[PDB]
């Protein structure tokens, strides 16, 4: 049996970037044909690993992460990047080895009236670490102390993406899949 990539990329529902979800893909040999030549993907960059050679790999231990972001935020799904997405929602290690995939989902994730189901975090004390995930929704104060609304200087940290079918491509929704490759040599004990 081959690795079930279709259930990741072709899944019906995708999550908000702040609540990005991770699928382990192992105990399978991967047929990368479906990603290599397609008309499906608008963005496809690989980092650290050879973009040409992924079908050669033989001992697969990959993690697939899924989320939705706005077109201009796809730039932030890269190593060493700054911004509200990279800092507070999904951070990629400098040493990243793996691939970053995204495709326009305007016709299925945006509406003329506006789809506000997708969310991102925009306030946080301190940047996420690589592959860290934060689904907390607690009130935020710019001085770090605890906080109870409706007190002054007390804010909620999540906000909606608003996806309309009339905006430019930079504001249209994009489904993203990040494939991370475990290190090839892991020491369990001495």
């Amino acid at each position: 049996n081959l690795c079930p990539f279709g259930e990741v990329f072709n899944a019906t529902k995708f999550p908000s970037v702040y609540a990005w979800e991770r699928k382990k893909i192992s105990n399978c040999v991967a047929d990368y044909s479906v990603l290599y030549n397609s008309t499906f993907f608008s963005t496809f960059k690989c980092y650290g690993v050879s973009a040409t050679k992924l079908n050669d790999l033989c001992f697969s231990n990959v993690y697939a992460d899924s989320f939705v972001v706005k077109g201009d935020d796809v730039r932030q799904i890269a190593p060493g990047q700054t911004g509200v997405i990279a800092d507070y929602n999904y951070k990629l290690p400098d040493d990243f080895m793996g691939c970053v995939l995204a495709w326009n989902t305007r016709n299925i994730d945006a509406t003329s009236t506006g789809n506000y189901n997708y969310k991102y975090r925009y306030l946080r004390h301190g940047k996420l670490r690589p592959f860290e995930r934060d689904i907390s929704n607690v009130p935020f104060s710019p001085d770090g102390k605890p906080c109870t609304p409706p007190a002054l200087n007390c804010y909620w940290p999540l906000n909606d993406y608003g996806f309309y079918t009339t905006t430019g491509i930079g504001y249209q929704p994009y489904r993203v899949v990040v494939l991370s490759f475990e290190g090839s040599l892991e020491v369990l004990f001495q």
């Epitope: 290599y36 030549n37 397609s38 008309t39 993907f41 608008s42 963005t43 496809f44 960059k45 690989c46 980092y47 973009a51 040409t52 796809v74 730039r75 491509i169």
Partner: nanobody, 125 residues
Framework: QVQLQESGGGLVQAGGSLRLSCAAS????????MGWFRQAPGKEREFVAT????????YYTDSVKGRFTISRDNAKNTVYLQMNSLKPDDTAVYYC??????????????????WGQGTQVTVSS
């Protein structure tokens, strides 16, 4: 050192065809992705199509989906853009562009490191 040059543009009229070409130099052409961009007068430069180093995977902007065809010739060190059923909207200066290391495909102008000068394409009606 590493440069592109456009060719094959000109005057055509609505419903005709035009076959753009772009020759590259400076490194191995078969190791990088290429992409076509265009800029209507006044409006900002937008993306048209992109081809992988192998020619296997492609992607197009919607305004041309079904009409335009991107293909390459690694033996010939050049990538083309067949344009059918042109419409006055398609008037633009067409920029050839080459991607960087690790970029399989991209519709994003910031992911291409080298740009050609552009060839005029005018469709009139």
């Amino acid at each position: 050192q590493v440069q592109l040059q456009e060719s094959g543009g000109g005057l055509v009229q609505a419903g005709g065809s035009l076959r753009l070409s772009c020759a590259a130099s400076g490194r191995t052409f078969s190791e990088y992705a290429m992409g076509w961009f265009r800029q209507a007068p006044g409006k900002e430069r937008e993306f048209v199509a992109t081809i992988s180093w192998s020619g296997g995977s492609t992607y197009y902007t919607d305004s041309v989906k079904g009409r335009f065809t991107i293909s390459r010739d690694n033996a010939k060190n050049t990538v083309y853009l067949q344009m059918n059923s042109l419409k006055p909207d398609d008037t633009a200066v067409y920029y050839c562009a080459a991607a960087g290391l690790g970029t399989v495909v991209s519709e994003w102008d910031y992911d291409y490191d080298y740009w050609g000068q552009g060839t005029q394409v005018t469709v009139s009606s």
